[PDB]
């Protein structure tokens, strides 16, 4: 199937500078505009740049405009965005997305069809700190679950059971502590009679940190 | 630069109901006939955009029949004929007659159902916790409707104020449910002072408390 896998995000300092990718797969990837979208904390989508196919023409926001540069390698099936300069504002989750066949004399829209699964850039001044995970311990249900405490920037992922433990669930969003670094709990409802026999996992990942950890809860 | 706005951005709707969700756009959007640049696209929590309508009604691969666009011009409506629970999420318009392309502010799609008490679960600070100075004691609220509930933290019989911090899921796509995890922030000393902690999540006039005790 078509996909868009982005890479690039994490902290970098107010006037500092980073580079996006996303590689394509599943199309004809020479043949279409390719384009980013942001999202801010809590905040809305918007369009931040384009490029087409060929890489003939280019298209920026206004607030970006000369700070930013996108581009692309078709060759490697990749673009890319050269984030300079950066701001407060820049702060956000970016997506690429697949946008109109450039190839054909009349462009063909089909709107912005495959979305990448993002990336976060922070603009901050502060330093990357890696999470503590902490258990959260033990009706017919019992409830445990994971504590990531004192993490930046954003964002941490959890699953359980390396992916198998999917349904009761529950991942709540982060939580920006007084200390200016973030929390998040992440739990889950399972059967008291399994608590015996089953393992419970939960499986941290801080990408901005290199932190990997997977700790089971007794 | 074209300016989009929506109509409503909360959407409470019963599942079966229809739901409609209105674009406007500052300029017109009609390339040409049969050709106006106007996209629906759905993000629900904690995943990417999907496209639902392209070109004002074209519907994208795999979008089921319920949804539908129409509207010309600088008038759009997204219909779902009939809600399910799992379309909740935020829908958003966008045009693609310009750069910059530009989006609506977001509709909120809210499920409503009937009133649901949340199971109450309590958690002391693990040992591995413990051994670094800091104390957390969590509690959970797990699958309650509606969204407005307090939660008190009590620490002795004390009252707590400005030491809790909470947050919240969105709506489970099967149940409609919300689930809140409190999280109270004691220093380990504090923490080894007293002995019954309590989180108290009142609905209404009704309290629920969950207890433990340190010692």
């Known amino acids: 199937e078509v996909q868009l896998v982005e890479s690039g995000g994490g902290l970098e300092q107010p006037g500092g500078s980073l580079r996006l990718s996303c590689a394509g797969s599943?199309?004809?990837?020479?043949?279409?505009?390719m384009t980013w979208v942001r999202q801010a904390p809590g905040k809305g989508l918007e369009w931040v740049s384009s490029?087409?196919?060929?890489?003939?023409?280019?298209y920026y926001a206004d607030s970006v405009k000369g700070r930013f540069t996108i581009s692309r390698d078709n060759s490697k099936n990749t673009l890319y965005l050269q984030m300079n300069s950066l701001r407060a504002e820049d702060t956000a989750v970016y997506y690429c997305?697949?946008?109109?066949?450039?190839?054909?004399?009349?462009?063909?829209?089909?709107?912005?069809?495959?979305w990448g699964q993002g990336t976060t850039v922070t603009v901050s001044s502060a330093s990357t700190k890696g999470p503590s995970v902490f258990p959260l311990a033990p009706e017919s249900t019992a409830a445990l679950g994971c504590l990531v405490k004192d993490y930046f920037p954003e964002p941490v992922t959890v699953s359980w059971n390396s992916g198998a433990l999917t349904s009761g669930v529950h991942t709540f969003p982060a939580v920006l502590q007084s200390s200016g670094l973030y929390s998040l709990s992440s739990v889950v409802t399972v059967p008291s009679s399994s608590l015996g026999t089953k393992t419970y996992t939960c499986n941290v990942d801080h990408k901005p940190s290199n932190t990997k950890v997977d700790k089971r809860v007794e | 630069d074209i300016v989009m706005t929506q109509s409503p951005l909360s959407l409470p709707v019963t599942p079966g109901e229809p739901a409609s969700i209105s674009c406007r756009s500052s300029?017109?959007?009609?390339?040409?006939?049969?050709?106006?640049?106007l996209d629906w696209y759905l993000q629900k929590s904690g995943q990417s955009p999907q496209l639902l309508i392209y070109?004002?009604?074209n519907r994208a691969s795999g979008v089921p029949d319920r949804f539908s666009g129409s509207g010309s011009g600088t008038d759009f409506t997204l219909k779902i004929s009939r809600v399910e629970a799992e379309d909740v999420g935020f829908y958003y318009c966008?045009?693609?007659?310009?750069?910059?392309?530009?989006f609506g502010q977001g509709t909120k799609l809210e499920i409503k159902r009937t009133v649901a008490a949340p199971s109450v679960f309590i958690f002391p600070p693990s040992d591995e916790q413990l051994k670094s100075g800091t104390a957390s004691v969590v509690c959970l609220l797990n699958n309650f409707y509606p969204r407005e509930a307090k939660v008190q933290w009590k620490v002795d019989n004390a009252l707590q104020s400005g030491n809790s911090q909470e947050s919240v899921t969105e709506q489970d796509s099967k149940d409609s449910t919300y689930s809140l995890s409190s999280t109270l922030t004691l220093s380990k000393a504090d923490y080894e002072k007293h002995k019954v902690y309590a989180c108290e999540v009142t609905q209404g006039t009704t309290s629920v408390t969950k207890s433990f005790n340190r010692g």
């Open positions: 966008m045009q693609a007659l310009q750069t910059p392309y530009t």
């Open positions: 997305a697949k946008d109109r066949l450039s190839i054909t004399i009349r462009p063909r829209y089909y709107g912005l069809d495959v």
């Open positions: 070109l004002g009604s």
């Open positions: 490029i087409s196919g060929s890489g003939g023409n280019t």
């Open positions: 599943g199309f004809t990837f020479r043949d279409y505009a």
């Open positions: 300029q017109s959007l009609l390339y040409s006939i049969g050709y106006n640049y």
